[PDB]
């Protein structure tokens, strides 16, 4: 039992940049097609591929940190949908 935490004095309580929509993980950069609509509230982390005509709506999280995530042609991921990938 610890029941003891150490607050950090350099922790940011308000990021003026907001949340960054495209979050590259090392060499994995999410690829979004120019014809694809991704809402400004969406977070794309890791290796996530969004193809032509696809659309991702508000509040959706697509974390491709573990495995690959692919959204097909004219396929849509609607509001507040969490798409995640596992190792196996």
């Amino acid at each position: 039992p610890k029941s003891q935490v150490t607050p950090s004095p350099d922790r940011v309580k308000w990021d003026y940049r907001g949340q960054r929509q495209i979050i590259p993980l090392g060499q994995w950069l999410p690829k979004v097609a120019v014809d694809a609509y991704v809402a400004p509230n969406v977070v794309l982390a890791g290796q996530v591929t969004v193809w032509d005509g696809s659309s991702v709506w508000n509040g959706a999280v697509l974390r491709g940190d573990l495995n690959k995530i692919t959204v097909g042609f004219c396929s849509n991921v609607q509001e507040r949908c969490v798409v995640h990938a596992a190792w196996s």
């Binding site: 097609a33 120019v34 014809d35 032509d52």
Partner: protein, 75 residues
């Protein structure tokens, strides 16, 4: 009537928006290069007409020379 300036401008705007469409971009992506394309198309059409007139004149001169050369065979 249909002048070379207007057909050139329409062709330039059409080719700019065709290039934008071919790249999956909105038609009026960069508005300034649409104006640039209209101007270039107008210039190219006017130059094409001006070159066509001179080209026809030169062809007429060459054909006159050829006919004169052929006609001398009968002497």
């Amino acid at each position: 009537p249909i002048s070379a300036t207007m057909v050139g401008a329409l062709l330039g705007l059409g080719t700019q928006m065709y290039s934008n469409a071919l790249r999956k971009l909105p038609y009026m992506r960069h508005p300034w290069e649409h104006v640039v394309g209209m101007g270039l198309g107008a210039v190219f059409a006017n130059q094409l007409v001006k070159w066509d007139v001179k080209l026809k004149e030169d062809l007429d001169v060459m054909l006159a020379k050829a006919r004169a050369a052929n006609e001398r065979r009968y002497f």
